[PDB]
Design an enzyme around this catalytic site. Structure first.
Site, PDB file in Angstrom:
ATOM      1  N   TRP A  88     -77.068  10.112 -93.792  1.00  0.00           N
ATOM      2  CA  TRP A  88     -76.926  11.260 -94.612  1.00  0.00           C
ATOM      3  C   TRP A  88     -76.993  11.323 -95.709  1.00  0.00           C
ATOM      4  CZ3 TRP A  88     -73.530   9.659 -90.509  1.00  0.00           C
ATOM      5  CH2 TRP A  88     -73.570  10.518 -89.357  1.00  0.00           C
ATOM      6  N   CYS A 142     -72.876  14.740 -96.134  1.00  0.00           N
ATOM      7  CA  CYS A 142     -72.933  14.472 -94.898  1.00  0.00           C
ATOM      8  C   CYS A 142     -73.736  15.586 -94.336  1.00  0.00           C
ATOM      9  CB  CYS A 142     -71.773  14.452 -93.886  1.00  0.00           C
ATOM     10  SG  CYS A 142     -71.679  13.685 -92.542  1.00  0.00           S
ATOM     11  N   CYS A 143     -73.225  16.373 -93.341  1.00  0.00           N
ATOM     12  CA  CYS A 143     -73.806  17.605 -92.638  1.00  0.00           C
ATOM     13  C   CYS A 143     -73.827  18.846 -93.206  1.00  0.00           C
ATOM     14  CB  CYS A 143     -73.595  17.483 -91.054  1.00  0.00           C
ATOM     15  SG  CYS A 143     -73.881  16.018 -90.301  1.00  0.00           S
ATOM     16  N   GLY A 156     -76.696  18.154 -87.147  1.00  0.00           N
ATOM     17  CA  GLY A 156     -76.477  18.554 -88.695  1.00  0.00           C
ATOM     18  C   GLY A 156     -77.044  17.572 -89.504  1.00  0.00           C
TER      19      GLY A 156
END
Ligand SMILES: OC[C@H](O)[C@@H](O)CO
Ligand SMILES: OC[C@H](O)[C@@H](O)CO
Ligand SMILES: OC[C@H](O)[C@@H](O)CO
Ligand SMILES: OC[C@H](O)[C@@H](O)CO
Ligand code: NA
Ligand code: NA
Ligand code: NA
Ligand code: NA
Ligand code: NA
Ligand code: NA
Ligand code: NA
Lengths: 759, 759
Positions: free
Chosen positions: A333, A418-419, A734
């Site tokens: 990520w 992250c997502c 994601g």
């Protein structure tokens, strides 16, 4: 209050502003970037050095994928910012340098988080942990992991065990923090250290006056640690022959300096997500200057970006097999937010926005960095089309609603962690919370808190629902109360975690690149929304009969009649989902939190859709026991059978207002459903997203969208002939992963997901 | 809730009470001890095993004394409860076993407090610190010392350098904590672990409900640590061949079990004071039972006591020379509170009260343990005389007012920590604060905050006092201000220190032997009280003329006329001393403290009287620059010249109500001033003390009294011939030391003090 020689020289030609007198990266960008509305025709290809370097690295990647194990890793060294000597792929070729350890892809030991996870990794890969390292981090330096388990309640351990609250940040870095690495390039380390010293001194009065004594003492120690970390960043860069005391003077140094800030972070913290930030446009300011001054050619610009991006493709962390189950695909990520529009209406898209996407071509598809497009209905069409084009060619990008987040923060310098979790760079962070199992929570409502699989009393001992048919209102009322209980256990578990994480693994080098006071939210995630929403529909629009066991435990259900399913744009099933999101949010919103982190929510699951699926028995919606849940907010596997506009409309209804931590949607559409040829596809893809993300006063819109453009048949072929798709990349929850990096079981989840055939 | 066979057999013959259903050592003592009112005629002599052991130990003690350095110490082992193997003097002769390391008098490394002090000790005693230990405690495990200096202010550092606030516990263990070691003998480890587990569980509701969130999490982790420390106590004992899972079954086990609890403490913490508590009477219950059942003789009882006391005489900690200047004579403060009266009017004196004192006969004079007599005008005259006699023969005892402290606490189970600081055993602790320089605070008031030696601004910038002659009202006003400033700097320094000690060196093994909630006070000490009182007196009743340098700094003072000096029962000056004690106390009383520890004050210095004296210039009373202050609350060297009764009267006037942490007075009287013969001396000493400690509604009385019965001529002979007084022991500030263990400078202080020549 005086800009020395160092700053004036390095900043020659830059437009003045507050940014020259205080730390303010946003102002620097606003007064110096060059909006770009042209097309991709200016883009160069890779150099020989880039291809040579990347090809060598891919040999290590192929090895990782087929063994599903690290190439190598430390067993006798505790990783810190300065513990490792310089490592290279090929020192003679690299334009941007820096590796986590002394060798490409060799993973490090970051013990501050817990020695048990490290022992588990050594066993899982037939390696042996050095006795001294083990002794130090068991008897001398207490770790986050041991601190959390010394305070957990037996209830929380039970939820963890039963699969109702599993995979929380008690055995891996919490992450969800983005230091503003751009600060290193813009001001240089000495300036930043001087500013942290002022911040430290600003707390003296409150300290002496007894004002919030313990919070003041804590923050002062944290600033002291941050300052010490900045100093270590310099020692770290010097190991590579660089002096970063002063600000970057050209494009190469701006990229090198920014990455050095990130490098310190991935050398000292093993956070789940170690996002990069919103840097492409910031870096364009330096590239643009060198080009006009004729100091670098366009191909040299591309090479620098490629070598930077290549390093982001090489970030690795030693994880446990259990981690592998919750977060599949060896994810990092290393998220980068590209483009967006400024508050002044100009596009924040630059030539560098294009150079970043172009790495997917120069070095082929790749899951990292996690390139995220800050989509706005008003972006240049040249860029909208090129993005769609990269998606169609690589299935490597995700899109997030800039028309929704920018006005929400009223800021044009937020990035994605992250997502799907946004934060204003250098001023905000999240206390990561993984996700809770809402589906199993519904079953507990029907079974009086007894776990349908372990016949264990987990939830509070209640009277299981009686009857041959399930009544909506009865089941629901019960679900409400059990949601209260989930909320309380979830918030308590997180309070412990973050108290311990601040104490035993404070992210000093990252926090050193933030303001003195950082906004913190407590991100709570919910898994299996569509399973629970569909389960409530099957109960409310059909006939569900509980198949009980000798103890009266509903271990299965039989459905009489069709019931509306989430993902088809049917307000009847879509309204239950919307409501569930709203119901959990209001619940956690009342509870007291550690360090007063403001509670927020996200409909995100990563690979928990599989983990929680395996630990949950048959549900009212007809889903079988041990069956994966849908990823994030995705309708259950294959249930969104009415085309693209249908499913996008259902997901786009989920309220971002009650899920500020984000809402994930993995959308895969077969090529021909998008058009006969590429020009048609580019245009149609861009048209779909314009509508999904469409935002106005009466329409909130969609928050995020992963985009895979492929045929289910290609993956099946990939499954049988892995050595044929070494770089095949796909969006899964994601973020992206190289298909050959997932396990057989994880690929099974992917190949059985919805492949939109129509529009 | 059911006493298994263990508890039954072990408690055979003991009277029942709450103590069998809950941890309540006081109740067990009340319902089982045998008051003693007889004389010392039953006492036995030393067995050859005892004498053989002590003689070999004295061999190390002589080495320590002549080298003024440790006999030996670790350079590569981080000490914990279980780190070292069993160690003995002679396994075949010892009745009570246990040593800090594997060898007699060998000092350990207690790194959690800070690595710098250990490096300094290595360097000073010519030993090389293991590189690994240094790395671990500089880079992986942050220490207390590191934590404090990371948060200190430049202001606190300036006070530290200048000699106004120096020697605080930022570079050594805080101590001032007495775990109830008796609980191990009485209940055994398993029962205590079970109790701690219930204490841990009792905090779950609050945790889940978000009540005092951070405080609750902090306490749960601390209880988790206490529990873990209890299990290590068992492992530690087991290495010596003992199983302490259950309660002690006889006298030897009761003594050994209690000592084992203490041993875990002195193996894991290096607090400046590591006191033993109030155990003699407690242990008499087990000794008495064994005597009456004929299981042991009286000589055998004395032997067990002697071997226990012998071990207390062998506690050692690795200190730096800096520490040695502040706390001279290799002190431990293994303090034992003997005698006293119960709330029910019965005496708490027992045959064991006499046995403990007798160790000064069986094994000769010794400074450790620090035997403290809890005096009451109602103690059995037999005991009073024997204690006075022991003082006349050894000068190894101190006395404290039981008539004053028992009523104040409304408890007959409180013990003395260090010198004079009382606490109810297992329910109270102090946040140690060392002492501040009150005399320098007056000079600052006169010099506008500028330090008289360093000629630098330390206190708040202010106008120095003008005039050829000082005026009491003005000087006292300026002083009142600088005392406000000293109070703030002092409490701020202590808030930082204890926040850090809790974080980086929580005394788990000790706190495991206390109740769940512990009362805590923040103890502030004052040094130079008599120097300050006399300075004011001189200013008020005589003509003090400041002599200033070219910059207006008052570097000397010339006095015209005589003025009352503290310690001559002259209310004119004693009232000024009482006023200062009251003022400072009311000022720190208004400040916020860490963990809400209640501020308390003590007039105690230890050897800071010498250190602050060296850093303080000429003062208004006439004391010359560099000269030692008086120890604790003592009149300045030689100023009390109107006899013992007068000086005692002066000190007793000092308000314990405003100095609850203690008031130390070192009283030295020549043999003949006490009486023509031995019997008369005993009777007279006992008389002076009853008068000194005399207490009633309108007469508080003295709180403490060190008693030296000697001739200055003898100490002079000792200075030239140390080898002739290997065991000569003298009281010096609220504890004792072997005269030979002091530096020449420290002896000079001792020899020039007041030797009372008359009553
Ligand atoms: O160490 C390799 C990881 O366990 C695997 O998930 C990579 O795909
Ligand atoms: O051995 C006891 C330690 O304090 C452990 O709890 C952390 O290192
Ligand atoms: O380590 C021994 C000390 O330096 C000495 O002061 C003892 O008297
Ligand atoms: O080197 C950075 C560490 O956090 C140190 O400050 C404590 O061990
Ligand atoms: Na390849
Ligand atoms: Na580090
Ligand atoms: Na705090
Ligand atoms: Na929405
Ligand atoms: Na410790
Ligand atoms: Na008398
Ligand atoms: Na008094």
């Amino acid at each position: 209050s005086e800009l020395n020689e160092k700053l004036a020289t390095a900043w020659e030609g830059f437009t003045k502003g507050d940014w020259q007198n205080e730390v303010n990266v946003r102002d620097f960008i606003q007064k110096n970037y060059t909006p770009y509305e042209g097309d991709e025709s200016f883009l160069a290809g890779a150099t020989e050095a880039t291809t040579t370097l990347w090809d060598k690295v891919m040999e290590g990647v192929k090895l990782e994928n087929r063994t599903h194990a690290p190439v190598d890793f430390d067993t006798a060294v505790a990783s810190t910012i300065t513990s490792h000597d310089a490592g290279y792929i090929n020192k003679q070729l690299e334009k941007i340098v820096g590796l986590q350890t002394e060798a490409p892809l060799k993973r490090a030991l970051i013990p501050f988080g817990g020695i048990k996870m490290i022992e588990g990794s050594c066993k899982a890969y037939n390696r042996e942990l050095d006795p001294m390292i083990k002794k130090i981090f068991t008897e001398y330096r207490k770790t986050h992991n041991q601190g959390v388990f010394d305070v957990y309640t037996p209830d929380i351990l039970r939820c963890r065990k039963s699969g109702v609250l599993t995979g929380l940040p008690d055995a891996y870095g919490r992450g969800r923090i983005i230091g503003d690495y751009r600060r290193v390039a813009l001001y240089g380390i000495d300036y930043l250290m001087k500013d942290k010293l002022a911040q430290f001194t600003s707390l003296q009065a409150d300290l002496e006056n007894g004002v919030n004594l313990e919070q003041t003492i804590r923050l002062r120690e944290e600033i002291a640690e941050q300052h010490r970390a900045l100093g270590q960043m310099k020692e770290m860069a010097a190991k590579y022959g660089y002096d970063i005391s002063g600000p970057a003077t050209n494009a190469q140094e701006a990229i090198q300096w920014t990455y050095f800030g990130y490098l310190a972070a991935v050398k000292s913290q093993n956070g789940a997500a170690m996002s990069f930030g919103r840097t492409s446009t910031f870096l364009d300011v330096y590239i643009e200057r060198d080009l006009k001054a004729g100091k670098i050619t366009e191909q040299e610009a591309q090479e620098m970006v490629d070598h930077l991006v290549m390093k982001l493709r090489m970030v690795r962390f030693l994880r446990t097999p259990e981690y592998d189950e919750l977060f599949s695909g060896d994810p990092i990520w290393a998220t980068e937010s590209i483009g967006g529009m400024g508050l002044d209406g100009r596009t924040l898209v630059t030539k560098n926005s294009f150079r970043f996407l172009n790495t997917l071509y120069t070095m082929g598809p790749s899951p990292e960095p996690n390139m995220t497009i800050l989509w706005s209905e008003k972006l240049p069409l040249n860029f909208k089309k090129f993005a769609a084009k990269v998606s169609i060619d690589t299935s490597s990008l995700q899109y997030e609603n800039d028309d929704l987040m920018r006005p929400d923060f009223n800021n044009d310098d937020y990035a994605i962690a992250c997502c799907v979790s946004p934060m204003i760079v250098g001023k905000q962070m999240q206390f990561f919370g993984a996700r809770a199992n809402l589906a199993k929570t519904m079953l507990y409502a029907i079974n009086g808190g007894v776990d349908e699989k372990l016949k264990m009393q987990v939830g509070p001992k209640s009277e299981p629902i009686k009857g041959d048919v399930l009544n909506y209102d009865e089941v629901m009322e019960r679900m409400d109360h059990f949601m209260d209980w989930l909320a309380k256990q979830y918030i308590t578990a997180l309070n412990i975690i973050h108290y311990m994480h601040d104490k035993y693994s404070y992210e000093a080098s990252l926090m050193a690149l933030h303001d003195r006071d950082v906004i913190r939210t407590m991100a709570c995630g919910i898994a299996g929304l569509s399973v629970a929403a569909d389960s409530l529909s099957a109960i409310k629009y059909a006939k569900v009969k509980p198949i009980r066991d000798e103890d009266g435990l509903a271990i299965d259900f039989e459905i009489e009649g069709e019931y509306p399913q989430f993902g088809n744009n049917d307000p009847r099933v879509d309204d239950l989902a919307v409501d569930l999101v709203e119901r959990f949010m209001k619940k956690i919103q009342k509870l007291h939190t550690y360090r007063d982190a403001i509670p927020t929510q996200s409909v995100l699951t990563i690979t928990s859709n599989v983990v929680y699926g395996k630990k949950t028995g048959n549900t009212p919606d007809g889903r079988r026991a041990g069956a994966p849940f849908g990823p994030g907010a995705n309708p259950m596997h294959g249930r969104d059978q009415k085309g693209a506009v249908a499913s996008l409309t259902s997901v786009a209804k989920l309220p971002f207002a009650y899920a500020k931590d984000g809402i994930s949607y993995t959308f895969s559409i077969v090529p021909n459903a998008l058009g006969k040829d590429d020009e048609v596809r580019k245009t149609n893809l861009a048209g779909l997203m314009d509508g999904y993300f469409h935002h106005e006063a009466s329409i909130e819109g969609g928050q995020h969208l992963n985009v895979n453009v492929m045929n289910r048949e290609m993956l099946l072929d990939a499954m049988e002939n892995p050595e044929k798709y070494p770089q095949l990349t796909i969006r899964v929850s994601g973020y992206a992963v190289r298909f050959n990096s997932l396990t057989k079981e994880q690929q099974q989840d992917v190949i059985t997901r919805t492949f939109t055939q129509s529009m």
